[PDB]
Each structure stands twice: as structure tokens, then as C-alpha cells.
Design a protein around this ligand. Structure first.
Ligand SMILES: CC(C)CN(C[C@@H](O)[C@H](Cc1ccccc1)NC(=O)O[C@H]1CO[C@H]2OCC[C@H]21)S(=O)(=O)c1ccc(N)cc1
Lengths: 99, 99
């Protein structure tokens, strides 16, 4: 799709059979989801955003379907204000910025 | 142009007499720039992201040039780790997401 920016670029994602809304976030290097359960091993990690640093759980090789497009990659889970899809997965789905 | 997301979408902006590098950030509602002593009135605001909130000064109707494109609108100034061009100005320069 082509998505304009007069509204937040929120899209439905499917992850682990669950449907969630997430924000396409070109200013995020990483994909960060709000607290949820995911299977398998994870590693503790820390990440910084505008307001400082948080702890997250880093899960590798997770499938997410983003607006029907398939990705498999790293997903960080922790106290983000909102689910964000970052460039690690935006690149997988062929997302670009155009003007 | 088209900007892929293999690396951060950093572009050149001008505000005035200051040229700075800023992210084209679809996850940012409003543009937030690092500390600068702009002329005119402003209002205090607090904005939130990963890690919590920061305090910023909201300046309105500021002309910025982004990759040679004209924009004018709100600019929040405060101690952000990274300059971001948010949706308020991205729309003005014709920026969409495409996949
Ligand atoms: C978390 C989002 C809903 C909102 N943010 C925009 C977001 O693009 C920031 C923009 C950003 C970028 C760098 C540093 C601070 C903030 N990125 C970010 O937090 O990314 C984190 C996840 O991947 C990592 O890569 C970058 C930092 C990590 S935000 O910076 O907090 C923000 C909030 C309000 C406005 N008006 C402007 C910006």
C-alpha cells in the first residue's frame, strides 16, 4: 500500500496467532512490542529512546505478518508506549519513504 | 525521492542559520529538535516515548527546509537524543510510506 501521514501509520499485524495494532516507525531501528508472551529463549537487553533507557526481552527469528507481508526477525518486548515496527522489519517487507 | 530503510533516514534540514541532520520519522507525531534558542513565543509541553517523557518548548509556524523542500509548522525543542522530523512536517513535504 501507499500510506500518507496525516494520521498515525497504524497497521494490523499477526504475531503468534494474535492480531495487534502497531505503528510503522521509520525512526525506530528496532521493533518493540508491549508486554506479551512469546515462546522460546530470549536475552535481556537494554534500549534507549527519547526519554531514556528501558529493559526489554530480545526474541530472535519471530514471524510477523505486517499488512499481509511476511517478516521473520528480531522482536523486543518491553515497556514501550506503543507497539512499533522498526527498520529491521520494515526493510524485510520492502517499505520505503517517498516524497 | 525514495529512501530505503537499510540505514537511518537522516536528511539535511535548515532552520534558519542552523543546518542539522534529522530523521524522517513516521513514528513521531511532531517534529522534535535538539536544543536551539529560536526567536519568538513558545509553550511548555511534555512528550513521551520509550524511556519516558522529556520537557520541550513548543514553537509554532517555524519555517524549515528539508532536502530543499519548504515546510512551516510546529517545532518542539528540547533535549532529545536525536532530531526527528515528525508527521506534522512530513506531510507538508509530500512524504509517504510505500510497500
Ligand atoms: C516511540 C515512538 C512511538 C515515538 N518516538 C519516535 C520514535 O521513532 C523514536 C525516535 C528516536 C530515535 C532515536 C532516539 C530517540 C528517539 N525511536 C525510538 O524510540 O526507537 C527505539 C527503538 O529502536 C531504537 O532505535 C532508535 C531508538 C530506539 S519518540 O521519539 O518518542 C517521539 C514522541 C513524540 C514526538 N512528537 C516525537 C517523537
Amino acid at each position: 500500500p501507499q500510506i500518507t501521514l496525516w494520521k498515525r501509520p497504524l497497521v494490523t499485524i499477526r504475531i503468534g496467532g494474535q492480531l495487534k495494532e502497531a505503528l510503522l516507525d521509520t525512526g525506530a531501528d528496532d521493533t518493540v512490542l508491549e508486554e506479551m508472551n512469546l515462546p522460546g529463549r530470549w536475552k535481556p537487553k537494554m534500549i534507549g529512546g527519547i526519554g531514556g533507557f528501558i529493559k526489554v526481552r530480545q526474541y530472535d527469528q519471530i514471524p510477523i505478518e505486517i499488512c499481509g507481508h511476511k517478516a521473520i526477525g528480531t522482536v523486543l518486548v518491553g515497556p514501550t508506549p506503543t507497539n512499533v515496527i522498526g527498520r529491521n522489519l520494515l526493510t524485510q517487507i520492502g517499505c520505503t519513504l517517498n516524497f
